[PDB]
Structure formats: structure tokens, C-alpha cells
Amino acid sequence: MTEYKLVVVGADGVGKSALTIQLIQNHFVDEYDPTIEDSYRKQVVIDGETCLLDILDTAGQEEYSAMRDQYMRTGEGFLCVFAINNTKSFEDIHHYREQIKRVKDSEDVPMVLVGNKCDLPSRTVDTKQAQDLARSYGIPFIETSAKTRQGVDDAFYTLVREIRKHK
Ligand SMILES: Nc1nc2c(ncn2[C@@H]2O[C@H](COP(=O)(O)OP(=O)(O)CP(=O)(O)O)[C@@H](O)[C@H]2O)c(=O)[nH]1
Ligand SMILES: O=C1NCCc2c1[nH]c1c(-c3ccoc3)cccc21
Ligand SMILES: [Mg+2]
């Protein structure tokens, strides 16, 4: 069975855990329980292929930044999440991309830019500005909501397709 190693990264509070738990369990976590590092293994069918998704839900708290080196070496694709109402999380994206590129020693790492919390009216990052950043990196961009499930399956399945197409 083809196995895909996905890593969910981004600033503290953007909704990494809520996105992962929505994808796998189909419900929304309202509480904010900061992550150290959790992992999940889930079988899914993507484009008629039974896939094993190995999903690593990482820490956004900068206190755990030394753990990034290990997961960036082993991860095959990265879901780079910011929240549409948190401009600092959007600026933090570039730092995660640069770190991943350095650890892999490559500019062609499978990645998807995710603008989460798109259900909220408190937007601070225009969709066009995020589209422009994703175009500069050569990666897909999707807006998501862990509350409504908008874009959630597409974000994860697009990342699988980016890994599959790169190999
Ligand atoms: N309205 C809304 N709230 C969201 C969304 N995704 C997450 N949240 C909320 O944001 C808060 C943080 O979510 P969480 O999933 O813990 O974020 P995280 O990025 O994993 C936090 P850490 O980096 O510390 O592990 C929670 O209150 C959660 O309900 C979303 O799409 N919409
Ligand atoms: O190497 C592994 N052996 C088998 C079990 C396993 C391995 N990596 C995993 C990850 C993961 C994703 C990105 O990096 C690591 C997530 C969940 C389970 C994993
Ligand atoms: Mg978390």
C-alpha cells in the first residue's frame, strides 16, 4: 500500500490540530489545547488508490522549534497553514518554507499553502495576497475551515497528489 508522510506546520493557533481532527474524525474542536507532537495513520481512497496517510500534527509554539529538524527530514509533504485572521501567521509561513527547503536541500519540496479559518469574518490576509505568495513558491493554495470542513479534504488530497507527482 502506498504510504504518504504528511506534516502539518504553522504558527501557534492557526488550526493545525482542528484541521487534522476534522479530516479524520469529522467534527470540530472548539478548545485550544497546544500540541507538542501527535501522529495519526489513516487509510483513505484518493483518485481510486488506497493510500495510507501518516499525518504528523506539529507544535506551533516556538518553544518546540528544535523538533522541526527531525520532522522536516522525514516528512514527504508539508501542509503550511496560516489563519486568515492572523497576519503574523501568514508572515511566519516564509520561515517554515525556508527551513523545510534548507533541511531537504531542495526548492521542489511537496507543499500546499492553507489559509484556515475562512468561516470567520475577521479577515486580515486578502486571498489575493496569499495566492500571490503561493504562486511565488510554485505551490497550490487553498482556503479552509476546520469548522465547516470547507477545503479540508481538498487541502490534504492536493498535498498527496503533490507528493505522488513529484516522485
Ligand atoms: N472559527 C474557526 N476556529 C478555528 C478553526 N480552526 C481552528 N480554530 C480554533 O482555533 C483555536 C486553535 O486551534 P488548534 O487546532 O488548537 O490550533 P493549533 O494550530 O493546532 C495550536 P498549536 O500550534 O499550539 O498546537 C481553537 O480554539 C480552535 O477551535 C477554523 O477553521 N475556524
Ligand atoms: O517513519 C515512519 N514509520 C512508520 C510510522 C510513521 C512514520 N512516519 C510517520 C509520520 C510522519 C509524517 C511525516 O513525518 C513523519 C506520521 C505518522 C506515522 C508515521
Ligand atoms: Mg495543535
What CATH number is associated with residue 71?
3.40.50.300
Nearest bound ligand to the CA of residue 12: 1
Phi, psi angles (nearest 5°) of residue 67: -75, -15
CB 8 within 8 A of CB 16: yes
**3-state SS, residue 88:** helix
Could you give the CA distance from residue 93 to residue 60 in angstroms, rounded to a whole number?
11
Ligand nearest to the CA of 61: 1
Phi and psi torsions of 116, nearest 5°: -90, 170
Which amino acid is residue 142, in one-letter code?
A: I
Reported in sequence order, the residue ranges of the chain that DSSP labels E, i.e. its strands, are 2-9, 37-46, 49-58, 77-83, 111-116, 141-143
H or E element in which residue 6 lies: strand 2-9
What is the resolution of the experimental data for this entry, in Å?
1.2
Substitution candidate for ligand 1 out of 35, 79, 80 with most atoms within 8 A of CB: 35
**Method by which the model was determined:** X-ray
Which residue segment(s) compose the domain that 62 sits in? 1-167
Q: Helix axis angle, 16-25 relative to 152-166, nearest 10°?
A: 90
Grid coordinates of 97: 518554507
SS3 86: coil
Tell me how far the alpha carbon of residue 15 lies from the centroid of ligand 1, in angstroms: 3
Total structural domains in the chain?
1
Closest C-alpha to ligand 2, atom 17: 54
Q: Which amino acid is at 15?
A: G
- Assign residue 29 a region (left: φ > 0; alpha: ψ between -120 and 50; beta: otherwise): beta
User: Which residue has the CA at smallest separation from atom 1 of ligand 2?
Assistant: 74
- Backbone discontinuities in the chain, residue before each (C to N > 2.5 A): none
- Closest ligand 1 atom to residue 35 Cα is 25
Query: Kind and range of the H or E element at 157?
Result: helix 152-166
How far, CA to CA in Å, does 53 sit from each of 6, 21, 41, 72, 118?
7, 13, 6, 16, 25
